Symmetry: D2
């Protein structure tokens, strides 16, 4: 009966909003988490109270390593084990921090390129091997006007655009659509406060950040039957921010 | 009180599906048309049968000329006259035909039609829409293939490129007024009536997702999303609806 | 047997630097101008001092109208008449002023902003090609995806020009005519107060200064040269990294 | 007095053409190579016979691993040790082969296709900058990144990452006077493995002359970007593809 979705990094913020909204649309969900065990379970409790046995949790470090492929295949497996099917993959988990050109660098590589790009590629491979099917990749609207000193992160997000397009092309014959949603500033990451207002003030549309829910709305669209011919598309949800010159 | 939308070139094909779906969502519609008088009238009948007083037609040439600004002002005015408001503008009307660089209309007529309909009229309508002013938005019909154009279609491609610029420029400028501006970019959808049948399968063969063109309804679905409350933070975005066609190398 | 080049809006600033550098490279040049007769003639005289009979001027308004096609045809024609050939077209002339969405009529703004930036380039390109290392270089704009506010028509003209660059490269490649662009960010500034000039210079990562006209010309020279023989449909940003800078 | 450049994968084909052209322009060159030992030395001989002490070779695997940072640091050191300076870095070395989504393990493919095409360029860029006049980096990109070969996701990911590196590094290193740009071939010298018929299929798609670019034509664009005629250009990627990327399916 009901379709099932994997949302990586689903315990908090945008991944949570995505998981909730998919659930409210009648998806069963695998809430993937790495460090946020208590939040992941709490979200699962909340969803299962609403409808029994519709939410499970799955722990995995999505850092690149010789065990990343096994971890990714296990995430896809948990969805089939729990629900008998996997209809939707949302690649939301993301590491984000500066790596100035002027943690070891190879750990930074592992987290920024691994979680942002290599895990999505491995998840994509496993999702496809095990088959309205679609993947949604959480991209970044500021990819071409990147944050200063954030090269590895930026590289990881560009790689994700490449994956989005390559996977859309290759998996289209399987009926698997592949798309993305690119936030501008949503709920800031902990991060600065005078710093956060500086950003909201740049945004043409209402001088504010998205909510997580506004991100989720775009995901919900792309997975829906209203996006059945859309693949290879990346929808910016940034209130115009990427259009604003320096 | 129901919202209202203007859809240009709405008598047939994609514009029609857009009009229908906006109406089904609860909009009152101004059906703009140029030559397709019967179909336009026919569609307004259908819509008004379903909910009386929810559909009018509006005839206008969208070729560029020194009266285009008045025609565009009039198209917007008509929505306000019939419905007391104008919440949504869809720029869908479009001329499309070859203009070879090395080669029965003059080149000034080709410029006026291809650039007027695809870019100048959208700019003038946008300006009238904004001036006359809730979830206000504009959706422009763009082209997923503008960076991999049809050979010998330079004026058309220039017009569609300009429409991308308009989408971004108007998104940026109208945002502080609460008007969002976005686009939907078809690949191949319902193919020209004048086009033969082997040429159609040639093009359908190219589409990775399902080896066919978009239904008009699939295009309309994307319009519906962009005007909806689920797209409130979305402005300056152009959604390709092309089944992966723009991803395919030569 | 020297090649020959048309540069539009060649009398001053960037088109002047382009015509000079093309002339230095061995081109004979048609210096097109609209209002700047004295500077156009003065450039032609300088250039002709350097080498007899290698520069002519050509006056024309590039605003769109029913006479634009004939104007563009005559510009191309003048190069064949003066020099017997036309190897290079540089589409440089450009109007630029705001057209807010919310004292010329709108249709005159359209004529000027879409005419000069896009329609005249298309008409010139058609004339250039009908009359045939042949290439065209269009002056595009590095900031076309992050436009100046209230410049919709200018921005529309420059997007149109990108489409032309691509469409003409595709269509003219069988005839061996390459078509490329050069996209300045901030170059010689629009007169303006040094405080406001400085605001823009401040934004440029590479050296915190605007491009010299010669720096723009350098990229044009490359694209027309034998070193760019396989390059077509390409637009080279010459912007010191300005378009990479977020808001 | 003479400037010096590092060129990766410089033993054959486009990297060779690039090192040859930089050499003809008066650069001293470090010819980096991985397996092409004989070709690398043969090339350095040739160059050194034209002017002596102007070419060294440097062997290194650019696969990602915990020792890639050291190898990249050493490549840059090669150039300072041989020539006392490092003016230009050309990131040319590149692994290229299919990785279908539906021999090598997947982690080896990630390591070779992402390492050579993106991680090594990032590490080399970091060491080039740390060790520091017309300083620049040129990355060999791919004009077809947005219309990719089917079943080449990992290669395509690496080339996209290399576009982000190009932009991120142009931005970050501009204050230090280091420019970062790219050159994007369409089809150039086709793989040695490729059959003639398959080659002509690709040649036929190219609007400008229905042929692939010569290695020299690719090199010309690199030569421009490092030149004083590109002094204000940074963050630009120049397609050298004869119009291939403009052709619809
Ligand atoms: N926030 C914004 O404004 C913004 C802007 C642009 C793009 N985005 C994109 O939108 C998406 C979600 O946004 P967000 O801010 O909600 O994400 P986020 O808070 O930065 O991180 C999302 C989750 O990813 C997981 N994660 C991080 N590193 C991991 C690793 N090594 N292994 C496994 N899991 C890991 C974490 O899960 P655990 O907590 O369970 O460990 C984390 O809570 C991301 O892909 C992001 O790149 C967001
Ligand atoms: N069809 C595709 O595969 C495809 C692909 C890419 C983009 N698009 C875009 O999607 C939109 C709709 O596609 P479509 O195929 O439905 O369009 P279409 O049928 O080619 O044209 C839509 C309408 O535009 C109107 N129009 C044409 N010239 C006009 C003028 N001078 N003044 C006023 N109206 C004029 C016509 O109205 P009358 O019939 O009333 O005279 C026509 O019915 C267009 O913007 C198009 O550029 C379509
Ligand atoms: N300067 C910059 O920072 C910058 C930035 C981005 C792009 N660009 C582009 O680079 C190119 C050259 O830049 P620029 O600053 O030197 O240009 P500009 O000084 O603004 O204009 C160039 C010339 O175009 C001619 N022109 C203007 N309107 C005309 C009309 N209606 N008919 C015929 N000719 C007309 C003028 O000729 P007369 O003087 O003879 O009347 C003018 O001297 C342009 O395409 C521009 O859009 C420049
Ligand atoms: N050829 C084309 O049509 C084309 C098309 C698009 C883009 N490009 C780009 O243009 C550049 C040059 O192309 P090309 O065809 O000359 O390149 P290529 O022959 O495929 O590769 C150049 C060199 O890369 C080195 N390399 C491969 N794997 C390596 C590793 N694990 N560690 C260190 N070095 C390694 C090899 O050096 P050894 O032989 O010494 O082992 C090889 O000779 C590349 O970046 C390519 O991606 C080329
Ligand atoms: N995982 C994240 N990706 N991007 C983030 C972010 C947070 N604040 C500003 C910009 C950002 N990209 S957080
Ligand atoms: N108005 C129109 N714009 N584009 C059209 C079209 C039809 N078939 C293939 C491609 C197209 N752009 S019809
Ligand atoms: N013709 C012109 N096009 N762009 C110009 C310009 C001048 N100052 C700042 C930005 C600009 N685009 S002038
Ligand atoms: N290292 C390489 N990158 N791309 C290559 C290539 C070879 N043939 C066709 C397209 C290609 N990108 S070889």
């Amino acid at each position: 009966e009901a379709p099932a979705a994997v949302v990586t990094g689903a315990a908090k913020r945008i991944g949570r909003a995505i998981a909730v909204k998919l659930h409210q649309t009648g998806y069963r969900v695998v809430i993937h988490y790495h460090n946020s065990a208590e939040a992941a379970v709490s979200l699962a409790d909340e969803l299962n109270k609403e409808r029994s046995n519709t939410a499970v949790v799955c722990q995995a470090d999505l850092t690149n390593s010789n065990v990343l492929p096994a971890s990714c295949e296990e995430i896809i497996n948990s969805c089939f084990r729990a629900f008998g099917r996997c209809d939707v993959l949302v690649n939301n988990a993301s590491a984000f921090y500066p790596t100035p050109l002027v943690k070891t660098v190879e750990t930074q590589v592992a987290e920024l390129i691994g979680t942002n790009a290599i895990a999505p590629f491995l998840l994509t491979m496993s999702f496809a091997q095990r088959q309205n099917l679609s993947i949604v990749n959480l991209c970044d609207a500021m990819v071409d006007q990147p944050c200063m000193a954030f090269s590895l992160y930026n590289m990881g997000k560009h790689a994700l655009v490449g994956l989005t397009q390559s996977a859309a092309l290759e998996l289209a014959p399987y009926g698997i659509r592949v798309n993305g949603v690119a936030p501008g500033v949503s709920l800031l990451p902990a991060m600065g406060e005078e710093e956060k207002d500086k950003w909201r003030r740049k945004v043409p549309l209402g001088r504010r950040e998205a909510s997580a829910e506004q991100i989720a709305d775009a995901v919900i669209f792309l997975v829906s039957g209203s996006a059945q011919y859309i693949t290879g598309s990346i929808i910016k949800v940034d209130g115009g921010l990427s259009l604003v010159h320096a």
